[PDB]
Symmetry: C3
C-alpha cells in the first residue's frame, strides 16, 4: 500500500508531497539540463520506485511549468513492475531554452488506478 | 460521491455530460481568447469544483479539437482539495490561430481514481 | 471483466500486452502513414473495443517513440461506450518525418478506473 523508492545515486532527492490530498509526489531532477526551444530531454531522477498494487505510475506535468514556461511531459506510463531509474521526458515548447538544475521539481508521479484485463477477440461487438 | 461546483462569475457555464457513460464533464470557457499558432493560453472557466473523494480531476483534451485543430491540453492535474478557479491550459500546435469564444467547450474533466500512498525510502528495491 | 475487441477489417492486428503487469495493451496501425515534422495524423487501428465497466480507455504514448522520436499522443479519451473504429491521434514534434508502417505499434490502451459522478451546483464551496 505504500509507495517505496530507493536512491540510485547521491544526486537523487526523495520525492515529496506537501499536501495530504495532492494527486502526485514531486519528482526532482538529479542533474542540470538545458533544453533548447522545441526540444525534448530525458531528465534522470536517479530513483527507482515500487508502486502499490493496482496502479501504474503516471509521470504528469507540474501546472506552473506548463502555464508559465510551456513545458510538457511526454511518455509518462511507468509500468507497475518497472524497477529501473525513473526518467522524465520533458518537452520544451517555449521559444526560449529551459534550464533544469539538480534539485528542481520537474514533474509529479501519480498512482493511477487501472484494471489489468485479459483480452478476448470476438467477431463483432 | 457527486461532483459539486459553484460559479465564480456569471460568465461561467455549469459543466455537462450528455452520455451517462462518458468519461468526462465538458468544461466551458468563461471568456473569448485568441491563441496564435504555437502558443498557449490559460482559459478560465470561472468555476470552482469539489471532486468526490478517492480521485483527482484531470483536465483532458476534447477529441475533435485535437484531431481537427491540433489543440492539446497542458498541465491538467487538479488536486482533490483545489478550490480556486479551474483553468484549462490549451496549447495550439496548429499553423493557424485558434479562437475560443465564451461558452465554447474546450476540455473535459475526468474523475480519475488514484491511491494516496505514504512514501517509504529503502536502501534498494 | 475482460477487454473484448473485434477487427473491423483484416488490416487490424489483435492488441498485445507482453508483461502481465504492463499498464496498457499495444495498439497497432492498420495502415501506413507518413507524419511530417510538426504535424499530426489520425492513425486508424480498424478495431472496436468494449472496455470493462468502471474505466475509460486512455490512448497513451509508447515510451520509446516519445523519448527517441519526439512522438506524442493527442486526444486519447475513449468513453466506455464507444464502439467505433479506435483512432490514435499522433503528434510528430520532431525535426524529421515519422513513418508509421501498417502493423507498427503506435500507442498503448490503458483501462483507467474512474468515477461517473452526478453533478450538483452549490452557491459557494
Ligand atoms: C526502454 C525505454 C523505452 C523506457 C525506459 C523507462 O521506462 C520507465 N519509464 C516509462 C515512462 C516514463 O516516462 N519514464 C520512465 O522511467 N527507453 S527510453 O525510451 O529511452 C525512455 C527513457 C526514460 C523515459 C522514457 C523513455
Ligand atoms: C498556482 C498555479 C501553479 C496553479 C493554479 C491552478 O491549479 C489548479 N489547476 C491545476 C491544473 C490545471 O490544468 N488547471 C487547474 O485549474 N498557477 S498557474 O501556473 O498560473 C496555472 C493556472 C491554471 C492552470 C495551470 C496553471
Ligand atoms: C467524433 C470524433 C470527435 C471522435 C471519434 C473517435 O472517438 C473515440 N476516440 C477518442 C479519443 C481517441 O483518441 N481515439 C478515439 O478513437 N471524431 S474525430 O475527431 O475525427 C477523431 C477521431 C479519432 C480520434 C480522435 C478524434
Ligand atoms: Mg555526479
Ligand atoms: Mg517560472
Ligand atoms: Mg501532452
Ligand atoms: Mg472544428
Ligand atoms: Mg487514471
Ligand atoms: Mg526508433
Amino acid at each position: 500500500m505504500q509507495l517505496r523508492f530507493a536512491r540510485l545515486s547521491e544526486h537523487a532527492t526523495a520525492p515529496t508531497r506537501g499536501s495530504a490530498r495532492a494527486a502526485g509526489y514531486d519528482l526532482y531532477s538529479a542533474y542540470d539540463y538545458t533544453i533548447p526551444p522545441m526540444e525534448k530531454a530525458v531528465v534522470k531522477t536517479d530513483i527507482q520506485i515500487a508502486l502499490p498494487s493496482g496502479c501504474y505510475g503516471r509521470v504528469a506535468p507540474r501546472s506552473g511549468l506548463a502555464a508559465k514556461h510551456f513545458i510538457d511531459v511526454g511518455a509518462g506510463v511507468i509500468d507497475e513492475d518497472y524497477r529501473g531509474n525513473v526518467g522524465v521526458v520533458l518537452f520544451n515548447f517555449g521559444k526560449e531554452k529551459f534550464e533544469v538544475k539538480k534539485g528542481d521539481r520537474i514533474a509529479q508521479l501519480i498512482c493511477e488506478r487501472i484494471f489489468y484485463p485479459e483480452i478476448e477477440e470476438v467477431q463483432a461487438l
